[model samples]
Target: RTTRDDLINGNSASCADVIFIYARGSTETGNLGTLGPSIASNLESAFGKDGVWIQGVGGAYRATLGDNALPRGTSSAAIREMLGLFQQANTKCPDATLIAGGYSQGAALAAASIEDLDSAIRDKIAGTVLFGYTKNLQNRGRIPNYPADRTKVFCKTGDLVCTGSLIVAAPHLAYGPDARGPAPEFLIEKVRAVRG
Candidate 1:
């Protein structure tokens, strides 16, 4: 299977059995931040290259530290981007298991988007993985309606971001490798349950 860097920018093949819609953190270049690709690679390695389709949310949501605190700034753009991509994936790859992932600000974006997704769209979501989730503290370590059984949140031990603070610490930047092992396993199980 031929792979192109462009595929990380939401150009996913419709043939895959799993479609991952991911959002990057503040100021990260490309839709798929380091962590996004890592998770995608892990999933693809286990499910086969053609078995997974990863799409980084696209739009003008310039991830910025300033917008991280506000609800309508870059958040709206990301929400729209993720939601639109979810619908697209559902339409183009109707049978695929839809997975959502994000890091830091992107995590907030995914949560917000999921909260607003239509019931049908929400039903199609097989799982979610969030790294350094910005709302960990505010939400008391849970995303409403995203069943804990199918959701995985990864917050580095000392990551202040997940502690409900806006401070970006070194711990927040380490999920690229930290989440590679467990997040994929968590998602794989969810997808398997949905597919089977």
Candidate 2:
């Protein structure tokens, strides 16, 4: 959608303390049901009944943007939306923490958005959860290279998209299938620890 209010108010209940911004893989229809109910169920358990899922832009590449120029800075839109949400949360739940999670294209967009964030807001970012991220686009070397004592980047192993070095020579190209999901129990434990 064009704005956070467009997605948040639409999907979330009145009591939601946090928002779950989701980026769907290449598709024009931005439907939450297509993403699998299990994922929604898992997130609802963590964020509570008020948790909201913001669907990414939809339609053809050109529909989201003109002529598919890689939708440069599209991630910025999501970041700005999150900032607004965070501002609202600050007044409501000053002690609350915000977590940004994404998969595939969404994962890459999340990374790009985090990279562009200012230090203050970036510090507030509790964690970044990425899945099915291709290796070509994530430039580990290009990352600010600053001390990451707080922000943690997790990736999946053997995920073709996350580790596509053999398929493409580009060191920092963001394609699709960003990263792999960790073992179920391990992931659940990690989320619990972070939420706690």
Candidate 3:
């Protein structure tokens, strides 16, 4: 995860059979949540672009009085910047299966991009694993056409970001370890479905 050269099956590689897109939260690094490497470990170094946290903080409440309530679209420049990999993954590996997930702000980016992403990758999306999904972004920013059943939104118990709990440090960091098990299960199940 040091340089672009470390990309799983990034642009430079001519072949990619699987896409594991794991976005981390703001101020977080790629290795913070085990989810980043969990999938890779589960899949044994599967291929795809390195999933980094898309950087941005635009509640824009005072400026626009608007919020993600309207589902404006994916705004994180990092999300937009890396979206090319989604389409490109398909171009390089049309038979590829997808595993996508994110933490906190990164979760927002993945959820917000669902619609356009669905249009781009569609059924190839094996599943989406979201950690620390604040404001119920899992539901708020979902694409109905996509297989909700295929998605697993994991919110740590009492985590404010996921549950809007009034507790500080509401187990916000719990999703990482918790995801080690289910995330892989989710991916394995959907992967079987895709392979069939």
Each candidate structure's TM-score, on Cα atoms with residue i matched to residue i, is 0.89, 0.54, 0.71
Residue-level lDDT of model 2, residues 64-148, one tens digit each, is: 3221224432345544554454444444443444455444454455555566666565555555555454322445522242234
Mark the regions of model 2 whose C-alpha exceeds 4 Å error after superposition: 1-7, 10-15, 31-37, 51-94, 135-137, 141-160, 163-195
Ranking by lDDT: 1, 3, 2
- In model 2, state the lDDT of residue 34: 30
Error at 148, model 1, angstroms: 1.7
Candidate 3 lDDT over 99-171, as tens digits, reads 6776665565566555457466867878877777654634653534567787777776677766542233757
- Per-residue lDDT of 16 in model 3: 48
TM-score pick, better of 2 and 3: 3
2 versus 3: better lDDT goes to: 3
Which candidate has the highest lDDT of all?
A: 1
Clashing pairs in 1: none
* lDDT (Cα, 0-100) at 82 in candidate 1: 78
lDDT of each: 0.77, 0.41, 0.54
Off by over 4 Å in 3: 1-14, 31-34, 45-74, 118-120, 137-145, 164-168
The candidate, 1 or 2, that scores higher on lDDT is 1
